[PDB]
């Protein structure tokens, strides 16, 4: 039994038993209070907050007689996402993200799961969920919620999973917006490397969802035990948002990408507007400096003092010279 | 429920009651009027602007019993279009969008509808729909729209909104056209912030087509209380259109995708060719002002006085070299 | 008339029937205008529509709408139908490219068929309609034995023809396009292109929105008889397809013109600066060297050393020159 | 109107299996194949060669097949769909070649008909993947005797879907070689084979974009066949085409990436060059300008006033030069 | 029969027989004392170096009648990971890397595999291997490896193999912070170099990898001729890291993906940085020079002698005007 989180401070044990009829549920510490909801009829959802703790875990585990290596893959954080299947229950690796705005940082929460009898298993690292409107539905008799069974109040819990990302969509929305501002108008330095936090964090996500679809995918193809009237229509809708996901990721791939060479555009212009200067001032010298190099130098034969008014007359056909070009220039480069 | 949108102005209700034979249309503020007509036989169609009301949404959906979610919803302008069956209502969302020519901005309103027995309700924030002609045929007894029922008129409502999308990409093209043109012969940076936005748009509007779907692939598939035949062919036609509509924003992308490089194609390539121009002047000017230059050293021993006519020669030999070089070049 | 020809001016009416034909020439516009009731079908032309007293007339001899006479005037505007009670506008254009020079121009055609009359004005001389006028002179085809309906189309088909000699004509330059940006490129290149993809965008301006003009037609004709007409709309439609894909065709080809030659010269870049630097960074040297020997001093090396003018100049020659092998490696 | 390529060789082939035996035959005879129509085994039909609008008309006549089917299968560029009907089933597909040799994808449509029993396939020219199809048809191997001209279709589709497998991969292979060249020994008009690869790989983006749309009609209907014996098959394919549309998604930012690998290494070695420009030019204006003010006439020298100017004037100015040469690369 | 490989050099066999009793090993460079060992009911281990030789090879796979083109393919050191399947033994084409980090360097190493009964072949390029623990398993009695037979320890191999491809990413992660660092800040030439060849390995890392991913899936699937689902499970264990491998290779290769063009970014604005200097430098000693080269000329009439202090004065002129260009700059 080895926790690998950051998270071990807090724990805490909730659970929401249903019916068609009445709805219970409460906070206890007591180990023993909510294991005897084992063998109850009606379907009875459990929640462990602060999964850090093994003893608890390694009695409630071993009452419900869970397999050794399914305990610790719960408590090791360190994993990629998939589905233990077995002839009693079956396990489930989760994943959940959060991203903090006004800030740039991708954290993680792995949710581990076991559908036993009429019993749902959700365990929680820490405080904090987007399955509170799960929790609405169920108490608030909202649908056929009351009626069917764990494998659809699962489901249910499936189903928040995937609106999870949906809300975190605004999110980078936000970060998006804050410095698209940024380079729309005076753009800077750091930008890129704020680019980077973008687009690093960008692909990050579906890198994520990628391997998580097959991991749903294969239990939208198999889940022998459960009822597959009631699976097909559940998990297909499921099957079909990770499509929406992943137009929504190469929406924004396109977006970090077209916003980086606005950026990167602009240097070309600000380059060009140096190099028009130091253009026009080098064609309005050499070719002048050209002119005092050769009455600069002294020869044989000087047609200078030979010829009358020779100095006057040498500013006098220079000067046009510098107007000529003004007017072949301020044009369509 | 708390209304979250920015118009909390004012506050319009409209009723439109009908059938193949008799026909009323009208406009009362009054939440007790509308009422009595949720036992009407014949499909009653109702207007409701103004939905930041807390206390009408929650009036209005007592006598017709509605789930909290299903009123707070509403009252939630942020929300992506979908569809929920009932034993006795249907509950869906969604998005009607605007867009104007001169400021480049994609505004929008979301749409609500509740569809129980024979009332409709259709939900506004603001002024404006697109259901003016729909009011036309049904005014005029034009159209089946009279003679089948609200479920017919259900499909009627959304035709005309899956219609607009239509018109709404004529207006797109034509902002493409012009964008695309101000990229081609103006390499200035005006249109680049307008491109990347209006891009956006576009990019910010196949967000609400694709899950769009859904809302008739739902309809499409199911309606267990609706009629089974006519509901299904009707909504297929539109189903097909939103395939039409949906790869036709996609299609739209790929005028973008490669013309944002064209603003920097132009400005990289004049401004290599405006160093073309420096460079032909900086070359030639400046080894013949190095040749004079040497003259303009002096020392004791000058050949160019030694021998007679040294300066005319020395203008001859120059002359020839920066012509040969303009040859050279333009090549 | 926003048009910019107010010289040619013609009058033409050639007025046919099952059995005989007439044609003729009058500069009087009061002279065509007792042909309204003519039994048989009355086709004129009116060439120079410049003139407004003959706009003015004819507007007000069938009681045509006063814009529409405005959209004659309008030389600018997109292709449409106008369905009206009694005739129908319809905006269409004549489109010329010479392969001389990359130059694309449209004649606007409008046309008016009211009561036992049909219209075409001109802006200037010429048309595809000769030999439209041999079939009228000639009894060729059903032009004769039916009214103004086929007539009518029997101008229209011409015109439908027209535009393959269009891609024909810019499938050539195309080729020869091919030819130039490819292989042997050069300056001047993407200009003509310039023209030629802009003419290429400004072509589907016209004929893609033409096509719900067209269709206008397609499932309509409310005063003529229909199924005559419907199923040349559909060959007639059947051709366009192909047209707005070649167009389609060479812009995914023109794209690919630029984009290599983009990156041709912009590599070109670093190799234009290679032979301004290894000229310009010989000179500042040599040239501050060579520019020394004129400044004035108290001790004077020039005398102070025999041969002070051959050495100096003999030893900085070999010093310059092994820039280039200081330069040239590799990068 | 055949608008195609290929209106040179023409062949008929069908393919009639049982559960137990099977028969095969070619025959260019029309009329041979026909009395088939009615054939209770489900009847596998090849026919190459669809420059041929009279067997097309013959035979779809003879089925009762509406000219526009006839005339949709007449037109080769037409993007693939799926069509419904009360009796038959009308879909549209196309196969597509690549060559490592010259850069270009060919391309070709295969348009399949399925009545009852009865299942068309039509070609242009020859090759297909459908031979190894044939062998489990040839050798009474695996399910596919068993089941009807459904699960046929479904497989002759599902070979199909592979084949972009392979064909992805010689795109890939084709980056590999673009993977080399680009960075190791980087060379123009690379690009320009690389812009027609974009342009290539665009184009393979234009036919299973909306294929989806034709596997999501048929998985999510199936409204005369047997549903729950097709259906959860089709998923499968269904789903596989996500699979496949995400690899090739994957590839367009490779390609884009690398693309811009030459464009980095081009204006990296510009920019070596400015660097060099610039600290020769800089450092000799201002020297070449001090000696250009001695070299100037006036009234009043005072050049001469100065006792030991000559050898410190070159030398003072010699510390500015030094000093800018420790200022290079601060 | 035609060897491709670099090293002709060294040639050696070590073969190790165990049992669920025993162990026993033995190193012979000689070819007639490994074959007799092919009719042992006990699980032999038997270890090639000195793939070289086309003749030996030939000949054990003469012995084993192995078909003549495999064992050319053994000799064939460029070939794609896969698994050539046989009605008794199989035929496995695999890979071992090797990245030092002083020197950026991946080197290859081919070794393919037979176990044909309870024989067990593995054909090395060079002496020393991964698979050094592997073998004290063998020899120590360490695990239930000697409870179970060859085909057991087949996957066994595969832990020693994957267990490098783990440190060898390990050891290549090093690099791309490193390189990072060289980008983020102080970003100068040759970096273009090491985004080069860490890349380059990266490409030929997946290169390897990708494809040899079909090698576990293949008998994953089946496994027809060893035990089955008491040899599969085991390599669903590999089958999760292969795919995990290959996105952490995924994960360098979007890394250096998006670290490359960060560094374009870098050069390319600071390339007009260089020529704010050069513009500025330059544009206002341009005139300054063409100034001096004026009076440097010589006339008839020279209004410098009738202009009183005309030294003093023309020099004074030129001390403000060049210094309001820095005014007149600041300015976009």
Redesign the interface.
Known sequence: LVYTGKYREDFEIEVMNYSIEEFREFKTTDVESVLPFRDSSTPTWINITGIHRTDVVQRVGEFFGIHPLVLEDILNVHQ?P?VEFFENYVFIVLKMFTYDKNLHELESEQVSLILTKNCVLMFQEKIGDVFDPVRERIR?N?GIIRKKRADYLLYSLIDALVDDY?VLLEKIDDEIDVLEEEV?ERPE?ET??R??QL??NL??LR?TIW?LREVL?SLYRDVPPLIEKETVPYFRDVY?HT??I???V??F???VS??????????????????????I???I??????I??????????????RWK????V?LAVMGVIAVIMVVYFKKK?
């Open positions: 990629r998939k608030y909202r949906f729309l330095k890129v490397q680019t980077h687009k690093r692909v990050e890198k391997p995918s079909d499509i929406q992943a137009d929504t190469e929406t791939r396109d977006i077209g916003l980086l060479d606005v950026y990167l555009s602009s240097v070309s212009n600000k380059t060009n507007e140096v190099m028009k200067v130091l253009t001032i080098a064609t010298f050499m070719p002048l400096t050209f005092a190099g050769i009455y600069g130098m002294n020869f044989e034969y000087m047609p200078e003092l008014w020779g100095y006057p040498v480069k």
